[PDB]
Amino acid sequence: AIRKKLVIVGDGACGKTCLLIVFSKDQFPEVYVPTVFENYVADIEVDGKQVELALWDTAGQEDYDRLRPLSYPDTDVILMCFSIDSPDSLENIPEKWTPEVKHFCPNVPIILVGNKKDLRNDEHTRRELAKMKQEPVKPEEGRDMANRIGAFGYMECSAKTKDGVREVFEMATRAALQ
Amino acid sequence: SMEMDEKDFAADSWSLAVDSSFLQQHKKEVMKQQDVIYELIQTELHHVRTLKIMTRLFRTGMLEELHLEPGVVQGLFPCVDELSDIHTRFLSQLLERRRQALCPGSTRNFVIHRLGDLLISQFSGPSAEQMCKTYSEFCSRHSKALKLYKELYARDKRFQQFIRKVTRPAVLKRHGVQECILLVTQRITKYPLLISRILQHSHGIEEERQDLTTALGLVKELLSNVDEGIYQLEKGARLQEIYNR
Ligand SMILES: COCc1cc(C(N)=O)no1
Ligand SMILES: COCc1cc(C(N)=O)no1
Ligand SMILES: COCc1cc(C(N)=O)no1
Protein backbone atom coordinates (compact mmCIF):
# COMPACT_ATOMS: atom_id res chain seq x y z
CA ALA A 1 0.00 0.00 0.00
CA ILE A 2 1.29 3.44 -0.97
CA ARG A 3 0.80 6.32 1.50
CA LYS A 4 -1.15 9.45 0.38
CA LYS A 5 -2.17 12.58 2.34
CA LEU A 6 -5.56 14.34 2.18
CA VAL A 7 -6.35 17.74 3.73
CA ILE A 8 -9.86 19.25 3.94
CA VAL A 9 -10.29 23.04 3.76
CA GLY A 10 -13.27 25.41 3.91
CA ASP A 11 -15.12 27.86 6.17
CA GLY A 12 -15.93 27.10 9.82
CA ALA A 13 -19.56 26.14 9.13
CA CYS A 14 -18.87 23.95 6.04
CA GLY A 15 -19.12 20.60 7.90
CA LYS A 16 -15.55 19.38 7.20
CA THR A 17 -15.01 17.97 10.72
CA CYS A 18 -18.30 16.03 10.59
CA LEU A 19 -17.43 14.62 7.16
CA LEU A 20 -14.03 13.26 8.40
CA ILE A 21 -15.64 11.79 11.57
CA VAL A 22 -18.43 10.00 9.66
CA PHE A 23 -16.01 8.54 7.08
CA SER A 24 -13.42 7.38 9.67
CA LYS A 25 -16.03 5.65 11.88
CA ASP A 26 -18.36 4.53 8.93
CA GLN A 27 -21.38 5.93 10.90
CA PHE A 28 -23.01 9.17 12.00
CA PRO A 29 -22.33 8.86 15.79
CA GLU A 30 -25.60 8.13 17.61
CA VAL A 31 -24.59 9.21 21.12
CA TYR A 32 -21.98 11.99 20.82
CA VAL A 33 -20.70 13.90 17.82
CA PRO A 34 -17.05 14.85 18.49
CA THR A 35 -16.12 18.55 18.52
CA VAL A 36 -12.69 17.90 16.94
CA PHE A 37 -10.85 15.41 14.70
CA GLU A 38 -7.15 14.54 15.43
CA ASN A 39 -6.08 12.47 12.34
CA TYR A 40 -6.80 9.04 10.82
CA VAL A 41 -5.10 6.71 8.33
CA ALA A 42 -7.82 4.99 6.21
CA ASP A 43 -7.16 1.66 4.41
CA ILE A 44 -8.78 2.24 1.01
CA GLU A 45 -8.89 -0.06 -2.04
CA VAL A 46 -9.99 1.78 -5.17
CA ASP A 47 -9.97 0.33 -8.71
CA GLY A 48 -7.74 -2.56 -7.56
CA LYS A 49 -5.12 -0.37 -5.81
CA GLN A 50 -4.47 -0.35 -2.04
CA VAL A 51 -3.71 3.02 -0.42
CA GLU A 52 -3.11 4.21 3.15
CA LEU A 53 -4.86 7.62 3.06
CA ALA A 54 -3.92 9.96 5.90
CA LEU A 55 -6.76 12.40 6.72
CA TRP A 56 -6.33 15.92 8.16
CA ASP A 57 -8.70 18.76 9.18
CA THR A 58 -7.92 22.54 9.10
CA ALA A 59 -10.81 23.36 11.59
CA GLY A 60 -9.67 25.93 14.19
CA GLN A 61 -6.95 27.29 11.83
CA GLU A 62 -9.23 29.65 9.78
CA ASP A 63 -8.19 32.85 11.69
CA TYR A 64 -4.43 32.02 11.88
CA ASP A 65 -2.71 32.73 8.54
CA ARG A 66 0.77 31.57 9.62
CA LEU A 67 -0.27 28.42 11.54
CA ARG A 68 -2.75 27.17 8.88
CA PRO A 69 -0.23 26.59 6.00
CA LEU A 70 1.69 24.15 8.26
CA SER A 71 -1.15 21.67 7.47
CA TYR A 72 -0.26 21.70 3.69
CA PRO A 73 3.28 20.08 3.24
CA ASP A 74 3.22 17.04 0.93
CA THR A 75 -0.56 17.02 0.47
CA ASP A 76 -1.64 14.65 -2.40
CA VAL A 77 -5.35 15.66 -2.61
CA ILE A 78 -7.38 18.64 -1.32
CA LEU A 79 -11.09 18.42 -0.45
CA MET A 80 -12.41 21.99 -0.69
CA CYS A 81 -15.69 22.15 1.20
CA PHE A 82 -18.72 24.45 1.34
CA SER A 83 -22.14 23.84 2.85
CA ILE A 84 -25.19 23.66 0.55
CA ASP A 85 -27.23 25.45 3.32
CA SER A 86 -24.76 28.39 3.11
CA PRO A 87 -24.34 30.21 -0.24
CA ASP A 88 -21.91 32.55 1.69
CA SER A 89 -19.53 29.56 2.22
CA LEU A 90 -19.53 29.02 -1.60
CA GLU A 91 -18.67 32.73 -2.25
CA ASN A 92 -15.42 32.49 -0.17
CA ILE A 93 -14.15 29.58 -2.31
CA PRO A 94 -12.71 31.40 -5.41
CA GLU A 95 -10.79 34.35 -3.94
CA LYS A 96 -9.91 33.16 -0.40
CA TRP A 97 -9.44 29.34 -0.28
CA THR A 98 -8.51 28.74 -3.94
CA PRO A 99 -5.44 31.12 -4.28
CA GLU A 100 -4.15 29.85 -0.87
CA VAL A 101 -4.32 26.14 -1.86
CA LYS A 102 -2.86 26.86 -5.34
CA HIS A 103 0.10 28.67 -3.70
CA PHE A 104 1.00 26.05 -0.99
CA CYS A 105 -0.15 22.92 -2.97
CA PRO A 106 0.82 23.61 -6.61
CA ASN A 107 -0.48 20.98 -9.02
CA VAL A 108 -2.39 19.13 -6.26
CA PRO A 109 -5.90 18.06 -7.44
CA ILE A 110 -8.76 19.90 -5.70
CA ILE A 111 -12.18 18.27 -5.36
CA LEU A 112 -14.94 20.81 -4.64
CA VAL A 113 -17.42 19.17 -2.23
CA GLY A 114 -20.92 20.40 -1.46
CA ASN A 115 -21.67 19.19 2.10
CA LYS A 116 -25.08 18.92 3.90
CA LYS A 117 -26.92 18.04 0.67
CA ASP A 118 -29.87 16.77 2.84
CA LEU A 119 -30.68 20.44 3.73
CA ARG A 120 -31.41 21.41 0.05
CA ASN A 121 -35.05 20.31 0.57
CA ASP A 122 -35.29 21.07 4.34
CA GLU A 123 -38.19 23.47 5.10
CA HIS A 124 -36.51 25.18 8.08
CA THR A 125 -33.38 25.83 5.94
CA ARG A 126 -35.40 27.29 3.03
CA ARG A 127 -37.33 29.60 5.41
CA GLU A 128 -34.17 30.82 7.18
CA LEU A 129 -32.33 31.59 3.90
CA ALA A 130 -35.36 33.33 2.24
CA LYS A 131 -35.16 36.02 4.99
CA MET A 132 -31.73 37.11 3.56
CA LYS A 133 -32.91 36.89 -0.12
CA GLN A 134 -31.12 33.52 -0.42
CA GLU A 135 -31.76 29.83 -1.26
CA PRO A 136 -29.76 26.55 -0.85
CA VAL A 137 -26.88 26.15 -3.35
CA LYS A 138 -28.17 24.61 -6.63
CA PRO A 139 -26.22 21.67 -8.19
CA GLU A 140 -25.31 23.82 -11.27
CA GLU A 141 -23.94 26.56 -8.96
CA GLY A 142 -21.59 24.03 -7.35
CA ARG A 143 -20.51 22.55 -10.72
CA ASP A 144 -19.88 26.03 -12.27
CA MET A 145 -17.76 27.07 -9.25
CA ALA A 146 -15.73 23.83 -9.47
CA ASN A 147 -15.27 24.39 -13.24
CA ARG A 148 -14.22 28.09 -12.66
CA ILE A 149 -11.60 27.32 -9.95
CA GLY A 150 -9.90 24.54 -11.99
CA ALA A 151 -11.14 21.73 -9.70
CA PHE A 152 -10.43 18.10 -10.64
CA GLY A 153 -14.17 17.51 -10.05
CA TYR A 154 -17.40 18.38 -8.19
CA MET A 155 -19.16 16.07 -5.71
CA GLU A 156 -21.98 16.29 -3.13
CA CYS A 157 -22.55 14.41 0.14
CA SER A 158 -24.42 14.37 3.43
CA ALA A 159 -22.48 13.49 6.62
CA LYS A 160 -25.91 13.19 8.36
CA THR A 161 -27.25 10.37 6.13
CA LYS A 162 -23.78 9.11 4.92
CA ASP A 163 -24.97 9.38 1.26
CA GLY A 164 -22.08 10.20 -1.06
CA VAL A 165 -19.45 10.02 1.69
CA ARG A 166 -17.74 6.76 0.57
CA GLU A 167 -17.69 8.00 -3.06
CA VAL A 168 -15.96 11.29 -2.11
CA PHE A 169 -13.06 9.52 -0.33
CA GLU A 170 -12.73 6.80 -3.04
CA MET A 171 -12.54 9.56 -5.73
CA ALA A 172 -10.05 11.54 -3.57
CA THR A 173 -7.85 8.40 -3.43
CA ARG A 174 -7.98 8.04 -7.25
CA ALA A 175 -7.06 11.79 -7.62
CA ALA A 176 -4.13 11.34 -5.18
CA LEU A 177 -2.87 8.36 -7.29
CA GLN A 178 -2.78 10.36 -10.59
CA SER B 1 -0.45 6.46 28.33
CA MET B 2 -0.92 4.49 31.57
CA GLU B 3 -3.59 1.77 31.74
CA MET B 4 -5.62 3.47 34.52
CA ASP B 5 -6.12 6.66 32.44
CA GLU B 6 -6.65 4.73 29.18
CA LYS B 7 -9.49 2.72 30.74
CA ASP B 8 -11.06 5.87 32.34
CA PHE B 9 -11.11 7.48 28.81
CA ALA B 10 -11.84 4.33 26.71
CA ALA B 11 -15.54 5.18 26.12
CA ASP B 12 -16.62 7.42 23.19
CA SER B 13 -18.30 9.86 25.62
CA TRP B 14 -18.87 10.77 29.30
CA SER B 15 -22.44 9.35 28.96
CA LEU B 16 -20.97 5.94 27.96
CA ALA B 17 -18.08 6.15 30.56
CA VAL B 18 -20.26 6.54 33.72
CA ASP B 19 -22.67 3.86 35.09
CA SER B 20 -26.16 4.18 33.46
CA SER B 21 -27.77 4.43 36.94
CA PHE B 22 -25.51 7.50 37.57
CA LEU B 23 -26.24 9.03 34.09
CA GLN B 24 -30.01 8.73 34.81
CA GLN B 25 -29.73 11.09 37.79
CA HIS B 26 -28.60 14.08 35.65
CA LYS B 27 -30.37 16.56 33.41
CA LYS B 28 -29.63 16.54 29.66
CA GLU B 29 -27.80 19.91 29.85
CA VAL B 30 -25.33 18.51 32.46
CA MET B 31 -24.74 15.43 30.28
CA LYS B 32 -24.03 17.70 27.20
CA GLN B 33 -21.55 19.80 29.23
CA GLN B 34 -19.81 16.68 30.67
CA ASP B 35 -19.51 14.99 27.25
CA VAL B 36 -17.46 18.01 25.91
CA ILE B 37 -15.29 18.28 29.08
CA TYR B 38 -14.61 14.51 28.70
CA GLU B 39 -13.55 15.09 25.03
CA LEU B 40 -11.13 17.91 26.10
CA ILE B 41 -9.48 15.59 28.71
CA GLN B 42 -9.47 12.51 26.43
CA THR B 43 -7.81 14.53 23.56
CA GLU B 44 -5.29 16.04 26.06
CA LEU B 45 -4.40 12.45 27.27
CA HIS B 46 -3.86 11.51 23.55
CA HIS B 47 -1.77 14.70 22.88
CA VAL B 48 0.51 13.88 25.88
CA ARG B 49 0.79 10.32 24.43
CA THR B 50 1.88 11.79 21.03
CA LEU B 51 4.62 13.74 22.86
CA LYS B 52 5.76 10.54 24.71
CA ILE B 53 6.03 8.67 21.32
CA MET B 54 8.22 11.58 20.07
CA THR B 55 10.50 11.73 23.17
CA ARG B 56 10.68 8.07 24.25
CA LEU B 57 10.15 6.01 21.10
CA PHE B 58 11.70 8.15 18.36
CA ARG B 59 14.14 10.64 19.94
CA THR B 60 15.65 8.34 22.59
CA GLY B 61 15.62 5.35 20.21
CA MET B 62 17.65 7.36 17.63
CA LEU B 63 20.19 8.48 20.28
CA GLU B 64 20.57 4.93 21.64
CA GLU B 65 20.60 2.93 18.31
CA LEU B 66 21.83 5.32 15.56
CA HIS B 67 25.07 7.22 14.81
CA LEU B 68 23.54 10.52 13.62
CA GLU B 69 25.52 13.76 13.33
CA PRO B 70 25.16 16.00 16.45
CA GLY B 71 22.23 18.42 16.29
CA VAL B 72 20.24 16.15 13.94
CA VAL B 73 17.92 14.61 16.62
CA GLN B 74 17.16 18.11 18.05
CA GLY B 75 16.31 19.28 14.49
CA LEU B 76 13.84 16.38 14.01
CA PHE B 77 12.14 16.92 17.44
CA PRO B 78 12.42 20.64 18.38
CA CYS B 79 11.14 21.65 21.92
CA VAL B 80 9.72 18.17 22.65
CA ASP B 81 10.95 18.11 26.29
CA GLU B 82 9.43 21.58 26.98
CA LEU B 83 6.15 20.63 25.24
CA SER B 84 5.98 17.38 27.26
CA ASP B 85 6.48 19.34 30.53
CA ILE B 86 3.74 21.92 29.71
CA HIS B 87 1.10 19.34 28.63
CA THR B 88 1.92 16.62 31.21
CA ARG B 89 1.44 19.26 33.97
CA PHE B 90 -1.83 20.49 32.37
CA LEU B 91 -3.08 16.87 31.96
CA SER B 92 -2.17 16.21 35.65
CA GLN B 93 -4.41 19.12 36.75
CA LEU B 94 -7.37 17.99 34.54
CA LEU B 95 -7.13 14.36 35.79
CA GLU B 96 -6.87 15.53 39.45
CA ARG B 97 -10.04 17.69 38.98
CA ARG B 98 -11.86 14.55 37.69
CA ARG B 99 -10.40 12.36 40.48
CA GLN B 100 -11.54 14.75 43.28
CA ALA B 101 -15.05 14.81 41.67
CA LEU B 102 -15.52 10.97 41.83
CA CYS B 103 -18.33 9.62 44.04
CA PRO B 104 -17.10 7.55 47.02
CA GLY B 105 -17.15 3.87 46.02
CA SER B 106 -16.65 4.70 42.32
CA THR B 107 -13.70 5.01 39.95
CA ARG B 108 -15.89 6.25 37.04
CA ASN B 109 -18.85 8.36 38.24
CA PHE B 110 -18.09 12.11 38.44
CA VAL B 111 -19.31 15.57 37.34
CA ILE B 112 -16.79 18.43 36.82
CA HIS B 113 -18.62 21.68 37.69
CA ARG B 114 -15.58 24.10 37.83
CA LEU B 115 -13.31 23.79 34.76
CA GLY B 116 -13.10 27.55 33.91
CA ASP B 117 -10.71 28.44 36.77
CA LEU B 118 -8.26 25.68 35.72
CA LEU B 119 -8.33 26.93 32.10
CA ILE B 120 -7.75 30.58 33.18
CA SER B 121 -4.72 29.44 35.21
CA GLN B 122 -3.29 27.38 32.30
CA PHE B 123 -3.75 30.20 29.77
CA SER B 124 -2.53 33.17 31.93
CA GLY B 125 0.74 34.20 33.69
CA PRO B 126 4.07 32.32 33.35
CA SER B 127 2.46 29.10 32.03
CA ALA B 128 0.85 31.10 29.13
CA GLU B 129 4.22 32.87 28.41
CA GLN B 130 5.95 29.47 28.37
CA MET B 131 3.27 28.07 25.97
CA CYS B 132 3.63 31.13 23.71
CA LYS B 133 7.46 30.93 23.61
CA THR B 134 7.51 27.15 23.05
CA TYR B 135 4.86 27.00 20.25
CA SER B 136 6.42 30.07 18.51
CA GLU B 137 9.76 28.15 18.42
CA PHE B 138 8.15 24.73 17.56
CA CYS B 139 5.89 26.00 14.75
CA SER B 140 8.76 28.08 13.26
CA ARG B 141 10.89 24.84 13.15
CA HIS B 142 8.07 22.59 11.80
CA SER B 143 8.96 22.67 8.06
CA LYS B 144 12.70 22.21 8.80
CA ALA B 145 11.97 19.10 10.92
CA LEU B 146 9.87 17.51 8.10
CA LYS B 147 12.59 18.18 5.46
CA LEU B 148 15.34 16.81 7.76
CA TYR B 149 13.19 13.67 8.28
CA LYS B 150 12.65 13.17 4.53
CA GLU B 151 16.37 13.61 3.78
CA LEU B 152 17.46 11.07 6.44
CA TYR B 153 14.82 8.49 5.38
CA ALA B 154 15.92 8.62 1.72
CA ARG B 155 19.69 8.48 2.22
CA ASP B 156 20.31 6.58 5.52
CA LYS B 157 19.70 2.77 5.52
CA ARG B 158 19.99 2.32 9.31
CA PHE B 159 17.60 5.32 9.82
CA GLN B 160 15.04 3.83 7.38
CA GLN B 161 15.20 0.38 9.13
CA PHE B 162 14.82 2.04 12.57
CA ILE B 163 11.71 3.99 11.41
CA ARG B 164 10.13 0.97 9.68
CA LYS B 165 10.80 -1.13 12.81
CA VAL B 166 9.36 1.21 15.50
CA THR B 167 6.32 2.28 13.39
CA ARG B 168 5.35 -1.28 12.30
CA PRO B 169 2.93 -1.98 15.26
CA ALA B 170 -0.74 -1.24 14.45
CA VAL B 171 -1.00 1.13 17.51
CA LEU B 172 1.53 3.45 15.69
CA LYS B 173 -0.57 3.62 12.44
CA ARG B 174 -1.45 7.35 12.86
CA HIS B 175 1.82 8.32 14.61
CA GLY B 176 4.76 8.35 12.20
CA VAL B 177 7.35 11.18 12.65
CA GLN B 178 5.67 13.70 10.29
CA GLU B 179 2.19 12.85 11.65
CA CYS B 180 3.37 13.53 15.28
CA ILE B 181 4.78 16.95 14.25
CA LEU B 182 1.49 18.02 12.59
CA LEU B 183 -0.60 16.59 15.49
CA VAL B 184 1.38 18.84 17.90
CA THR B 185 1.11 21.97 15.70
CA GLN B 186 -2.67 21.45 15.34
CA ARG B 187 -3.29 20.83 19.07
CA ILE B 188 -3.30 24.51 20.12
CA THR B 189 -5.99 25.47 17.58
CA LYS B 190 -8.36 22.73 18.93
CA TYR B 191 -8.69 24.50 22.34
CA PRO B 192 -11.10 27.38 21.31
CA LEU B 193 -13.41 24.86 19.56
CA LEU B 194 -13.60 22.65 22.70
CA ILE B 195 -13.89 25.62 25.16
CA SER B 196 -16.65 27.37 23.11
CA ARG B 197 -18.71 24.15 23.04
CA ILE B 198 -18.21 23.61 26.85
CA LEU B 199 -19.29 27.26 27.39
CA GLN B 200 -22.45 26.69 25.30
CA HIS B 201 -23.61 24.18 27.98
CA SER B 202 -22.30 26.06 31.08
CA HIS B 203 -24.88 28.83 31.54
CA GLY B 204 -26.45 27.24 34.69
CA ILE B 205 -23.86 28.81 37.03
CA GLU B 206 -23.07 32.42 36.15
CA GLU B 207 -19.54 32.28 37.76
CA GLU B 208 -18.73 29.26 35.46
CA ARG B 209 -20.07 30.97 32.31
CA GLN B 210 -17.92 34.04 33.14
CA ASP B 211 -14.79 31.94 33.85
CA LEU B 212 -15.11 29.97 30.57
CA THR B 213 -15.68 33.28 28.67
CA THR B 214 -12.43 34.68 30.21
CA ALA B 215 -10.57 31.39 29.39
CA LEU B 216 -11.75 31.49 25.75
CA GLY B 217 -10.45 35.06 25.38
CA LEU B 218 -7.06 34.09 26.91
CA VAL B 219 -6.67 31.07 24.53
CA LYS B 220 -7.48 33.29 21.51
CA GLU B 221 -4.92 35.93 22.68
CA LEU B 222 -2.26 33.16 23.06
CA LEU B 223 -3.03 31.83 19.52
CA SER B 224 -2.86 35.34 17.99
CA ASN B 225 0.57 35.89 19.64
CA VAL B 226 1.92 32.48 18.49
CA ASP B 227 0.62 33.08 14.90
CA GLU B 228 2.36 36.53 14.86
CA GLY B 229 5.67 35.04 16.10
CA ILE B 230 6.09 32.40 13.38
CA TYR B 231 8.67 32.67 10.57
CA GLN B 232 9.63 29.30 9.02
CA LEU B 233 13.29 28.39 9.37
CA GLU B 234 14.94 26.77 6.35
CA LYS B 235 18.25 24.87 6.46
CA GLY B 236 20.91 26.77 4.49
CA ALA B 237 18.79 29.95 4.22
CA ARG B 238 20.95 32.96 3.37
CA LEU B 239 20.76 36.22 5.34
CA GLN B 240 19.78 38.06 2.11
CA GLU B 241 16.65 35.85 1.68
CA ILE B 242 15.77 36.50 5.36
CA TYR B 243 16.14 40.33 5.39
CA ASN B 244 14.30 40.56 2.02
CA ARG B 245 11.22 38.86 3.68
C1 LIG C 1 -24.59 3.15 22.30
O2 LIG C 1 -23.20 2.85 22.26
C3 LIG C 1 -22.74 2.66 20.94
C4 LIG C 1 -22.41 3.97 20.32
C5 LIG C 1 -21.51 4.92 20.58
C6 LIG C 1 -21.77 5.93 19.64
C7 LIG C 1 -21.06 7.23 19.49
N8 LIG C 1 -19.75 7.17 19.29
O9 LIG C 1 -21.69 8.30 19.54
N10 LIG C 1 -22.77 5.62 18.84
O11 LIG C 1 -23.19 4.33 19.28
C1 LIG D 1 -16.47 4.33 5.45
O2 LIG D 1 -15.59 4.25 4.34
C3 LIG D 1 -16.07 3.36 3.35
C4 LIG D 1 -14.92 2.73 2.66
C5 LIG D 1 -14.72 2.24 1.42
C6 LIG D 1 -13.41 1.74 1.44
C7 LIG D 1 -12.69 1.05 0.33
N8 LIG D 1 -13.14 1.28 -0.90
O9 LIG D 1 -11.74 0.30 0.57
N10 LIG D 1 -12.83 1.91 2.61
O11 LIG D 1 -13.81 2.56 3.40
C1 LIG E 1 6.17 20.46 0.77
O2 LIG E 1 4.94 20.82 0.15
C3 LIG E 1 4.92 22.19 -0.20
C4 LIG E 1 4.60 23.07 0.96
C5 LIG E 1 5.31 23.91 1.73
C6 LIG E 1 4.38 24.46 2.63
C7 LIG E 1 4.65 25.49 3.68
N8 LIG E 1 3.79 25.55 4.68
O9 LIG E 1 5.63 26.25 3.59
N10 LIG E 1 3.17 23.98 2.44
O11 LIG E 1 3.30 23.07 1.36
Domains in chain A (CATH in brackets) are 3-177 (3.40.50.300)
Distances in Å between the Cα of A58 and the Cα atoms of A10, A111, B121 are 8, 16, 27
Which element (helix H / strand E) includes B216? helix B206-228
| CA–CA distance, B47 with B124 (Å, rounded to integer) | 21
The C-alpha R_g of chain B, in whole angstroms, comes to 21
Alpha helical stretches, state H, B53-190: 60-65, 72-76, 80-101, 115-122, 125-140, 142-155, 157-166, 177-187
Length of chain B: 245
Task: Check if the beta carbon of residue A52 is closer than 8 Å to that of residue A153.
Answer: no
Instruction: State the virtual CA torsion across B69, B75, B76, B81 in degrees, nearest 10.
Output: 110
Query: Residue A46: CB within 6 Å of ligand 2?
Result: yes
**Interface subset of A 31-90, CB within 8 angstroms of B:** 31-32, 34-36, 38-41, 54, 56-57, 59-61, 63-67, 70-71, 73-74
What residues contact B95, with CB distance under 8 A and at least 6 apart?
A: B5, B41, B45
The alpha-carbon gap from B23 to the nearest alpha carbon of chain A, in Å, equals 13
Å resolution of this model? 1.6
Task: Check if the beta carbon of residue B243 is closer than 8 Å to that of residue B150.
Answer: no
- Per-domain boundaries in chain B: 1-245
